[PDB]
């Protein structure tokens, strides 16, 4: 029962090396008839995957073409764990990183010439921003629509309800985005019956675990 | 060797056959084709390698097919955890290693025109020294919508950005905002804020707009 633990510093300031390990369960380095390849994939947001870069059984190192000067791999083999470093990271370098094992073996071994074995991934978010709470401002209303906008956080994530949790129906909590001072901001909105506005009240309850944030706002229609 | 996969985005009903193609830039033998799938927030799995043979654990409903140039993945039967991402992968005798683009499966629904609205920034922001401008598209598909930003009847460019939700479990529409930044030094200089939206359930594009500091 193979399995890959990844561990590495996750938030990273621009320019910082990013610096991640993985260690192997379960299998040796090379393998009962030296096969295994052991490889760094990423996927940035919204994007797809990329390889990053390989060691193998018998030692050999190679990257992807767009990385190589900046990315290092390699292997303590004493403990059973292989690392990546990827220099002078950039807001192109945020992405999902995950170590995979693959095989090239010449019974026939399960999965031959594939990656059956993933590491649960470390999500890398690259800016200078620390710790922040976010600022919570009302988007004031047949069909009404109302929400809040959580802006200028660090990092994530942002929780938001509705009353406390209890409405959900027509809520929408959009995926948060980068902006490009480093500070995260998402909106919640939800469409509620415009006949509603005067009997229920409509509060965003916003909860930032990094800052221990914790916001109650009501939203109301302007006049 | 580039993988382009096809289509962009499957859409399709539970039960139905998908067919999901993976396109080689050169000849390449089966061996070195493997297909993967991903959920959103999960690793990657791998559901066939050397073209053809399933890993382990992997059902039947899955096969692959194809020689040369051209692979692709079969799903006999879309079952719910079906809907998701799938990835080709060139796997050769030796590194580099290349991914195709990914093809999204998603659920097949009747068209469904997005409900427009548009917020200016609240006077609690505006006190702050930033604007923010919120146009939202509730509850709308198929998921390829184009919004545009109007200021004083200009259109707007690289100070915007845009949230999409993953497809809704009950109904099986997508909703969307999109942002617009400006200091607030800039927003007091213009009058009319307008966002257009252009979507395949619209027989024209509706403009929600407002004059900033009208009642």
């Known amino acids: 029962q193979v399995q890959l633990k990844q561990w590495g510093a996750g938030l990273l300031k621009p320019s910082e090396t990013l610096s991640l390990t993985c260690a192997i369960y379960?299998?040796?380095?090379?393998?009962?008839?030296?096969?295994?390849?052991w490889n760094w994939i990423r996927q940035p947001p919204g994007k797809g995957l990329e390889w990053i870069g390989e060691?193998?059984?018998?030692?050999?190192?190679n990257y992807a073409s767009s990385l190589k000067s900046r990315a290092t791999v390699s292997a303590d083999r004493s403990k059973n764990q292989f690392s990546l470093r990827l220099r002078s990271v950039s807001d192109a370098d945020t992405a999902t990183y995950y170590c995979?094992?693959?095989?090239?073996?010449?019974?026939?071994?399960?999965?031959?010439?594939?990656?059956?074995?993933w590491s649960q991934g470390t999500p890398v978010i690259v800016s200078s921003a620390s710790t922040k709470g976010p600022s919570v401002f009302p988007l004031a209303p047949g069909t009404a629509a109302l929400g809040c906008l959580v802006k200028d956080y660090f990092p994530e994530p942002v929780t938001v309800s509705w009353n406390s949790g209890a409405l959900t129906s027509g809520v929408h909590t959009f995926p948060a985005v980068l902006q490009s001072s480093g500070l995260y901001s998402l909106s919640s909105v939800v469409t509620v019956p415009s006949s509603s506005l005067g009997t229920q009240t409509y509060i965003c309850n916003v909860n930032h675990k990094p800052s221990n944030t914790k916001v109650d706002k009501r939203v109301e229609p302007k006049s | 060797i580039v993988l382009t996969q096809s289509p962009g985005t499957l859409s399709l009903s539970p039960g139905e056959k998908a067919t999901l193609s993976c396109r080689a830039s050169?000849?390449?033998?089966?061996?070195?084709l493997a297909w993967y799938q991903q959920k959103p927030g999960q690793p990657p799995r791998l559901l066939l390698h050397?073209?053809?043979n399933r890993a382990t654990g992997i059902p039947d409903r899955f096969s692959g097919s194809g020689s040369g140039t051209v692979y692709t993945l079969t799903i006999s039967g879309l079952e719910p955890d079906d809907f998701a991402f799938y990835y080709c992968?060139?796997?050769?005798?030796?590194?580099?290693?290349?991914f195709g683009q990914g093809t999204k499966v998603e659920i097949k629904r009747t068209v469904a025109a997005p409900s427009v609205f548009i917020f200016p920034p609240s006077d609690e922001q505006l006190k702050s020294g930033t604007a923010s401008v919120v146009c939202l598209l509730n509850n709308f598909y198929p998921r390829e919508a184009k919004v545009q930003w109007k200021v004083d009847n200009a259109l707007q460019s690289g100070n915007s950005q845009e949230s999409v939700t993953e497809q809704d479990s009950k109904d099986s529409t997508y909703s969307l905002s999109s942002t617009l930044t400006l200091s607030k030094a800039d927003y007091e200089k213009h009058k009319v804020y307008a966002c257009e939206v252009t979507h395949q359930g619209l027989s024209s594009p509706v403009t929600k707009s407002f004059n900033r500091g009208e009642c």
């Open positions: 995979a094992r693959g095989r090239r073996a010449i019974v026939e071994p399960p999965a031959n010439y594939g990656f059956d074995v």
């Open positions: 379960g299998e040796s380095f090379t393998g009962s008839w030296n096969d295994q390849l």
């Open positions: 060691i193998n059984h018998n030692g050999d190192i």
């Open positions: 050169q000849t390449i033998a089966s061996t070195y």
């Open positions: 050397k073209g053809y």
């Open positions: 992968q060139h796997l050769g005798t030796s590194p580099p290693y290349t």
